[PDB]
Copies of this chain bind each other. A is one copy, B any other.
């Protein structure tokens, strides 16, 4: 695949850019810009997704209080009502108060995003972030 093209820009914007490359550990600006583009294309793709398309994949990362009783069940009822399909979940303890969970999800972009918003709103949930992928990155 890999093809190389050229880009222009405001040498003013470019000092914002070239400082990110430093404090972020990039070898080149070409490398930071690549990543920024890939992200934007993934977001645009999810923005404009149909609902017969239940084929997107994402990972939901949740940190929550695992002595918060019945939180697990609340989380399951929500997932079950959201329309998404959980392919896999992994759970670890981060400490006596906190558990971290990875939930691998299939569905359409808006069921998945909803699931995230509903789960983040639950008492005991301290963190709920979505990793999105699009077909072009891997098909």
Q: Mark A35-52, 1 if CB is under 8 A from B, else 0.
A: 011111100110000010
**Smallest Cβ distance from A90 to chain B, in angstroms?**
4
Cβ A126 vs Cβ B138 within 8 A: yes
Is A88 part of the contact surface with B, judged by Cβ < 8 Å? yes
Count of residues in A whose CB is under 8 Å from the partner chain: 73
Is A53 part of the contact surface with B, judged by Cβ < 8 Å? no
A88 touching B86 in the complex, CB below 8 Å, given contacts A131-B131, A136-B13: no
**Smallest Cβ distance from A133 to chain B, in angstroms?**
5
* Copies of this chain in the oligomer: 4
Bound form: Cα–Cα A69–B9 in Å: 33
Cβ A138 vs Cβ B98 within 8 A: yes
A36 touching B40 in the complex, CB below 8 Å, given contacts A1-B12, A89-B90: yes
Cβ B1 vs Cβ A5 within 8 A: no
**Smallest Cβ distance from A116 to chain B, in angstroms?**
9
Which residues of A are at the interface with B, using a C-beta cutoff of 8 A? 1-17, 20, 23-26, 29-30, 33-34, 36-41, 44-45, 51, 57, 59, 61, 63, 66, 69-70, 72-73, 76, 85-94, 97-98, 100, 102, 104, 110, 113-114, 117, 126-127, 129, 131, 133, 136-139
